[PDB]
Design a protein around this ligand. Structure first.
Ligand code: L50
Ligand code: L50
Ligand code: MN
Ligand code: MN
Lengths: 410, 410
């Protein structure tokens, strides 16, 4: 039995995780949902508790703690350990009855819970790409200390890449470890992109495109922030850096390719030039499930891929003139140091300004470029706690710098 | 240091094997070519011996044995073991210095050599699909006795399938064994076909196609027999049965799909419904090389796949009305017993009759159908020697029956 905790159980990753766990458990009892953790959605956590009956419930916000306790009394034959805040999260991470932790929380609490999952030598199914981009050095250092911890990628392209690898090789290394690509005989990565809603726009059309245009065309339904990143292709820019850190692939060996059908989820070229790819309908249940079953697979009742019906798969190179965020991401990654931290932080601000109709499409990349140009490389801290503080300081500086650039031009 | 013998070294598979070995050896000294074996092409063998300097040379035709001995005296610093006939082939197979044997021989001598390779517990890189189709039972039995012997598939689609698997699971089993698909979590196979030259033709157009029409294959120059099989799609029919035997995949779980670009070489759907596929330009060096490097990969200098340039990949269902050979292959496979032997043997005759303008396109399938309808299931011998004799008897019976049907019509 696979003992799982879900952090951010009411968000998109968390709900998809529970959906595929539910369906797989109908076929064979494979998963024990041991713990659920949410910020403040007490009623939604209660409904999940009633169905899954986890040993642990944790809610971050103290103001709904007593309500959760009273709601849980209604459930028959059920006496969970009901916990609160960062201390509850740490208790869940340290439990000997939990093997795998799904991190479906964004922002700092995602990184913080990832840190504690790694410190307790757990398998960590990580969906939060911003944490890998911003704090990749820190995660690498931490995984080198806590040698039985493993990050398994959930981001769909990185799951695809991971699924293209021979586990006879993967098991002799792990993600975020130096020489991962060499041990797995990886030569090059094709990183697939939907292209986003603006993929066919002219430069003149891009100049005054708005957030409404990005949001009101959802071919895949997803959150506002990632939708804007998909529109600018900064999502793929971040994913390039995510690929570099997860798999130790050189930036010159990562190619972004626009695959509008979203069937092939990414491809790995090996040193012999044979290419392996992973394919399915766009459905986050497969990447999430693989993160929890790896190195095995289990039966699902998902719709089988009908390739004949799909009929055509297409690929083209993205235009860097139309999607300058892609170039900025490569430049930041190649520069190294804390430039990825700065890229991510400045994008956080610029994305949100565009989302709220404060700046235009090309202002996004302008702001990010200016913050990157402003940044000065720092000596990388040797101590993990100092390094974390350094990352947070630079993240905060870069957000403030982006906001300051906006305030001056406004 | 990979120790390899090449059987049929001057044929298409043999020459491609030596080509990729040559190129890979320039990058790193990986392969020692330990033995070369040919029928009667003494000059071509001498030229290969000059380059590769194998410990063993064998020529099947005793009439050119002394000629080979005299030619080989011209090579400096080289004192090989020079053998002849079946006795030389068997001595090579029994050598402790040889680990892997590439079988690039068609017809009976290919099967006989495969048998001896298996009896000596070697890794056998096998492209001869007709032998797997015709004698799969016998090969399975032989592989159960000789526990360290392994067949590694070289047929491009089956190499593709094999490359899509997790070697952590493959290493717990081996090809042409019961439960291979269960151990590897395989649910279903997409078996890719070029579709040959006739995909867009009407039934009335197919009625009148000639072997000259059939020989103009859209993607690939290859031998006349396989070119005719590609035109009728009996090539894919035979490969369906090959898939069933190599990977223990049920016939209901093998889907033939027409992929005219011949970039994706086949796909494996796992029990979670995730699909893995292998891709490269049409080039037999990749399947041959993997058969010799498995479970590892080595560096090549092959042209990298340019997916953006390829641009489009297409997939559609084959029409069984237009390509009735496909249906006959499934029927023979599903029926089991020696029906695959009969299918292969009758096709051998019908293919050749069509190639030499003696029958029409739909006569190929008509003849095969009539022979299959005339066969009666026979009790399968539990004795290995009697089983091989049954297979030979039924093969011969089926060829004669096909010829008799033609004769009585003609
Ligand atoms: C599994 C799956 C594959 C593809 C899609 C379509 C959206 C792709 C991505 C969102 C993402 O980063 N995922 C899903 O990891 C948008 P884009 O950057 O344009 O490729 C959804 C779900
Ligand atoms: C490696 C490689 C892949 C594909 C091709 C194109 C010809 C495909 C095949 C020939 C074959 O059975 N091979 C190569 O195993 C013809 P078809 O039956 O129509 O699919 C050539 C070479
Ligand atoms: Mn993604
Ligand atoms: Mn083939």
């Amino acid at each position: 039995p696979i003992n799982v905790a879900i952090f951010g159980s009411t968000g998109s990753i968390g709900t998809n995780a529970l959906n595929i766990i539910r369906e797989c458990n109908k076929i064979e009892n494979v998963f024990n949902v041991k713990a659920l953790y949410v910020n403040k959605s007490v009623n939604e956590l209660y409904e999940q508790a009633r169905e899954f009956l986890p040993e642990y419930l944790c809610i971050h916000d103290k103001s709904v703690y007593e309500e959760l306790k009273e709601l849980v009394k209604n459930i028959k034959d059920y006496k969970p350990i009901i916990l609160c805040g960062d201390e509850g999260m740490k208790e869940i991470c340290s439990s000997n009855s939990i093997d795998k932790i799904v991190i479906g929380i964004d922002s700092f609490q995602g990184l913080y819970s990832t840190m504690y999952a790694i410190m307790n030598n757990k398998i960590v199914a990580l969906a939060n790409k911003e944490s890998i981009v911003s704090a990749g050095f820190f995660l690498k250092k931490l995984l080198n200390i806590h040698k039985n911890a493993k990050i398994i990628p959930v981001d769909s392209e990185h799951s695809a890449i991971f699924q293209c690898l021979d586990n006879n090789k993967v098991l002799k290394t792990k993600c975020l470890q130096d020489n991962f690509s060499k041990i797995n005989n990886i030569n090059k990565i094709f990183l697939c992109s939907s292209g986003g809603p603006f993929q066919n726009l002219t430069m003149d059309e891009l100049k005054n495109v708005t957030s409404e245009n990005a949001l009101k065309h959802p071919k895949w339904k997803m959150g506002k922030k990632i939708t804007i990143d998909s529109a600018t292709m900064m999502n793929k820019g971040l994913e390039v850096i995510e690929t570099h850190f997860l798999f130790d692939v050189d930036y010159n060996d990562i190619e972004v390719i626009v695959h509008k059908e979203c069937i092939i989820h990414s491809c790995v070229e090996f040193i012999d030039k044979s290419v392996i790819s992973q394919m399915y309908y766009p459905d986050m249940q497969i990447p999430i499930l693989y993160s929890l079953t790896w190195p095995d697979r289990i039966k699902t009742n998902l719709k089988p891929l009908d390739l004949a019906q799909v009929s055509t798969l297409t690929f083209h190179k993205p235009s860097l003139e139309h999607f300058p965020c892609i170039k900025l991401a490569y430049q930041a990654g190649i520069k190294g140091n804390f430039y990825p931290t700065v890229l991510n932080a400045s994008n956080e601000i610029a994305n949100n300004l565009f989302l709220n109709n404060k700046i235009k499409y090309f202002d996004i990349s302008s702001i990010i470029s200016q913050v990157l140009e402003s940044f000065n490389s720092q000596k990388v801290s040797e101590n993990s706690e100092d390094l974390m503080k350094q990352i947070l300081q630079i993240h905060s500086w870069a957000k403030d710098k982006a906001t300051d650039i906006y305030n001056k031009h406004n």
